[PDB]
């Protein structure tokens, strides 16, 4: 058993060593597929980041001025590297380096603090007041130098130098100068609606016209448009509140403090607009004019005072600046809060407002009723906002933790730039202002927590989605190859011929599994090494990956085993295998979309498919990679997400279970659906059963004669045509005998012998073999059987010696005995010189000898030979005769022959069948006694060229010498007579033979040989008693019509192949689309009350700064102990889901003394207060840095409050260092015991802060301005008074001191708003009046987004884009598997000679290829129409939109037009169909998928500009492949529609045309050019480099060489061919000339070079030397006319397996140009005059062995060519059929044409052949006419005898011959016959002497020939 696997594996590895290219490709293909990933990985480095310390973010509780400053400066999240001054303990400004700050600092330190300056100013003011009442100088001069250095210092100097440019490039520069002016940051900085496909796309307002023009100027340009779209609602929007109760009115009246404060500046600018003209009037006409005149008069008045030490223009610019400001500020909408009454009405008005983009928010107070006016203690509200302006509500944090602070100022701060945090703060400030009478002014500053230096690997996003698909597409080639190999091996009968030799089924399955597993193991080892050392996966243990890949290889091998039991034709198993393998992977892509509602049970159930479990395992690999973990043998078994029972170990466990199930199911189905050549198939309950899985022509059984094989009432009916092939046999083959099985063609010989084996199931009767019935016990029978099939089936690239060694060892023989057996059986069959020639380079006869040879190796007790010698020369048949007669001791040999002398000699009991049933059977002597026995004399006639002599005088002579004589046959010089055998004169016959011998030339006879009754005459008795269209347009149209009809007639009968190659890919696309529409329905967004305890079990900290105040002390208390941190545990109940726990006393954690030693040892104080922990990445990646033991100082004291959370009082510590340096430890402590990471600190509140406020005190400013108004006569104004009336409340709410900071972590989405809510609860509860318990009161915010049917942009567009990309790659799959199906039929034709036979007819390469291209275009058009119809049906708007449908149609049709002529040249490489199919399909798959993946992933995630430069080039490099063109077209058609949908969502409706020359038009034009160029190229590939002698022979050579004759048709001249790598000419130096009236016969030993001569004569192979002129036109130069003057019948039949005989004749009569009116008669004649009358309407596949030769001969003869080359026309044909063919050929050569006939039956080439030529070793020996040959090379008579009873009885006759005929050699003494070459005087003496002693001896049969041709041929074969 192990030995048998050893042998099969050795054979497989030998055949694999013979072909190394396929091996290398099979080991390299997946590595080749895994190249774009390695290139991208080498393209994207790590790029570790830095600390990223973030600045403050003010809020409307902190006043207005810092609010706007923090809106303007912090609009980008600058990401500094060094800590901001905002994270200092009691400092919150964060703008200390601003130039205004420096100038103000200088102004304060110099001027105001200076006491003398204040005194001087007061003195000047008092003097001015005294002067006004009426209506010092040194001190003022003293402060004049004080002013100087104030300008000189670089603050004021810088202010002037930077205001001097004041602004070219306002968009570029104005914000630059403002940002350097207002704040002073030290240089901080830090699909997709991209223009990639953008370019292709292409109101009264009830407001002042100023703002009409303003909004249009904003709306018109995208640079101003996308910013305005997000900024508009805040400046112009509305706010809507439902309850309308006076309580809500009170809350919102208290909440307009910001908007009233913003309206105050509008009041002031209006006041200046009014009052300015008064200033101008005072400067123009006032007492100032007298003042100036006095100043002008100073040189005459105060010249000394003057010497001691534009107005319009400055007033002008100031007037302009204020007005330009005024026009903008005028139409801000600062009356926002607009009441309503119900939720539904609010939503209706929200729909009304959102279209114009005004809706800001809607505030709903659920607890309120319209008739309410008292605020409850615990008040709640909900801020209903849009969904593109508020973060998602159903989820609280992203599914997978990835490193990164999440600080993008656009896609993460939706709560800030959108306007949720601001409005929440205004409303909560309103509430805390309405409950308590007091205020407690405390502003709130956010602060984002800092971060360590991460690495941010940019590759893991790409490898996240394209890794499983590539790791699955890697193995599609191996899967297709394994399934195709299994099906092809079981289709070519190569598996049944193994089961006959003894091997079981278990061994075959085991070797298939072992070989496939070894190959997959090699490729997998290579793949894991390549991935590891390619740095694609960094941390993952390679051993785990290797084991995972082994598990998947086993699973996919068993899947291949299951798939191989479905199909039965390799042309049908090459497409379905790959498509079904990929179809079992789409469920994984569907499972990626849901990502939820995936119960582990359902995940396992879906994973019950192996390629889905592989996808799951790959997902877990990728997830564990992006965490720095990897699967180090402990990580296995636990998922990286929140809660999954699914894991990695269980993934490959399910894979192994899948492999087991598939293997068991394949094994079960194999024995119930065995296929075509299957044995009697067991019933479906094989496991259930306890048993393991004229009646006188027949001779009676003689005594003894034990039977070996019995057949009883056998019936076999091939269904489609009835007509049972084997009707009712009652045969019984015996033990020690060679039973010859004869019968006419299509009688039931091969079918009966196949039923005798297991190859076919009988449909009735029983077949006992050796006593063991055949359907029940077929294994014991086949342990001792050897068969030789009619069509030789044997491995190609195995040699001869290896064939015999394989088959001899496969039956128990030790290595050594196989050597002896092979040597002996090479000696016995004459194959010694061909020991090492491959079994495909052998000649036909040598293959036939090898088959019968390998049928006898080992000891088989039932040997079944089917045509053992059909195509073997008359000499090599003696070797086979001795071989049979030697192995007849106990074997029940059963030979089915068509040579009657063979069956008479060898057969010991013959049985003739006819029409299925047995006709007669018995010992041949008994048969000849039953039917008419007689004595036949077969006299030939010569020619002078009309056949010499006449049948009149010969007839008269024969009837004169014997009056009863009947003429039996007279076909072409044969003229066989029949004479009576009983009661003859003994003298009349002798006189007749004397008369014939003495006059052998007067009658023209040349030969005559008597014979006792042969078997052939008995068998004949049984059988009887049982013009051209002219060239040009007409002929080309006829050729096109004929070829199209042939293709159609072949297609319509094999409908399964047409479906599985055309319609199935469309079904695959349809299934992909049907899975595309199964997506979860959109559910509405929930309430999501915002509180910090959402995440649960977290760390929070607080830091009490500024501890001297009392209000902050009570604030810290009411935030710490009494009411708790947040809103939970407020003594009344809140969210019963979250309980009210108990607290823990103040506790400080322990620490190692190592830390304490470090902390009292060094002196790193107040900068770097903890060891600056290294965070490098280049050495080891370690995304989160490793940091020493003293990371963040000694741990701060902690406790657990009533709410479950850890409070860390980091009061007197560095905050930023603590969080930065203890983040990684906090993450790592979360990683363990859970294997999924999550941060445990989400924020805290740091009480304390200060904001330096200028001391204006309010009243001083208004008094100062009023004093200037009284003095300057500028006082007075309605609007001026109205604006200046509320000044103190304008300076109150500007800036707020004593603030609160709120540290928040953004990786939890709802952290900032929840902690803002907590802070406002603290400020309310701190501000409360006394005696009122703080616990009762609180606030809570609810965030329910607006109740619209809409998804967020960040999710809906990616879903649709990914879906369309997947659909595109599925379409590429489908349309790449189709065009490879057009090479199956081309190779099927080329491997046969059907293409060459059509070329021998009128068809010329251009017409053939053009017609094939037309048919392929039609079929592809059908498939593309199916795909397009599917897209129309599913309403995929991206492709089937009325603007994008022509693009799709053109794309698909031109891809079909452009890829087919690319597949045509590949039909010249592969020599087996279904291997070209697999290879071409896999190549197309790889090219198209890779090109589309590149144009997709690189475009979406390759920001690097260096990659883009290479990519741009590669587009133009890859334009050459039409697959790339189709991929780009489809992906761009998806992306353009995605972008258009994004645009139309906002309301622009941008429409694009697809045919832009940059979009897809280049692809279309390139496809056209590619199609034309490739068709010309395939035509070129077709046209160019397509993939001392005797005396008579010497005389003919001189005749040809010196002067060539002018009457010959065929004139060979020094023909020669040396086969490549042989070093000995197969055919060398032939010179013959065939006249137009003779049948030149080319006899020859096997492997002498006969078929090669025909091959080079027609034009198949390549001549090596010399011409061969056919009717004038040479071969080497021009072959078209040679083909026009020739008809060829190949040795091996070249027919189409699915066209009847009639349609074959119709095709080949149309091709030769017979007119369409005279084709019925030609077909009828060729059908009637060659047999074929019954089988003229059955497919050429359902033909018998000889009925294919009949068809080939009929094909060769249509069209009347004047030179017909028949290459063995009669091999395996009935005597009657070959008689009719002789009649045809004789008619031919009598009509006036010539035929070159090759045959191995010497009766033939003696009857109808005019001139012979025996060819040995590639050169002639005789080349003479029949008479002259039998004269020069022969003498004497041949007395052949047959004695009856064995070998020791042969002695008396030898003594008789030696005593009578003195000189008489002995030739060919077989087991029972003798053949002496007597040299007597005359034949009458031999006849009389042999007949008179016939009774004394035991002569059964006899024959006295006269130097037959067999003697000549056997002499030649013996010599060489
Ligand atoms: C769709 C057309 C594909 C098709 O019809 O293929 C047919 C069989 O294909 C199948 O059975 C597909 C099986 C689908 C299984 C679903 C998993 C014909 O194959 P066959 O070799 O002629 O039958 C031999 C008997 N086992
Ligand atoms: C890459 C190099 C591909 C070279 C493939 C050449 C080749 O023919 O290999 C053939 C198979 O080659 C392959 O499998 C690789 C496929 C190459 C894709 C072609 C584009 C063997 O087929 P065959 O019919 O047994 O050949 C017998 C006589 N040629
Ligand atoms: C809001 O949507 C919810 C479903 O999530 C529905 O119950 C409710 O009636 C809707 N309210 C309005 C005002 O449309
Ligand atoms: C503290 O721990 C370190 C860690 O190995 C050790 O080497 C050292 O000896 C300990 N004692 C000190 C630093 O005093
Ligand atoms: Mg047969
Ligand atoms: Mg041959």
Author numbering: 3 to 137, 273 to 303, 308 to 331, 339 to 350, 362 to 468, 498 to 881, 914 to 1164, 1199 to 1280, ...
What do the study's own words say?
ABCA4, also known as the Rim protein or ABCR, is an ATP-binding cassette (ABC) transporter essential to vision. Transporter assays have demonstrated that ABCA4 actively transports N-retinylidene-PE across disc membranes. These studies provide direct evidence that ABCA4 is an ATP-driven importer, transporting N-retinylidene-PE from the luminal to the cytoplasmic side of the disc membrane in photoreceptor cells. It consists of two homologous halves, each containing a transmembrane domain (TMD), an exocytoplasmic domain (ECD), a cytoplasmic nucleotide binding domain (NBD), and a regulatory domain (RD). Over 800 mutations in the ABCA4 gene cause Stargardt disease, the most common form of inherited macular degeneration.
The final model contains 2 ATP molecules, 8 lipid molecules, and 1920 residues. In the presence of ATP and absence of substrate, ABCA4 exhibits a conformation very different from that of the ATP-free structure. The two NBDs form a closed dimer. The two TMDs are also in close contact, leaving no cavity at their interface. The ECDs are positioned differently from that of the ATP-free form, placing the hollow channel directly above the EH3-turn-EH4 cleft. In ABCA4, this role is fulfilled by the mainchain carboxyl group of T2070 in ATPase site 1 and the side chain of K1054 and mainchain carboxyl of D1061 in ATPase site 2. For example, in the ATP-bound conformation, D1102 in NBD1 forms a hydrogen bond with H2202 in RD2, and R2107 in NBD2 forms salt bridges with E1270 in PH1. The helical subdomain of NBD1 moves together with TMD1. This twisting motion, not seen in any other ABC transporter, places helices TM1 and TM2 within van der Waals’ contact with TM8 and TM11, closing the TM cavity completely. ATP binding induces a major conformational change that closes the transmembrane pathway to release substrate.
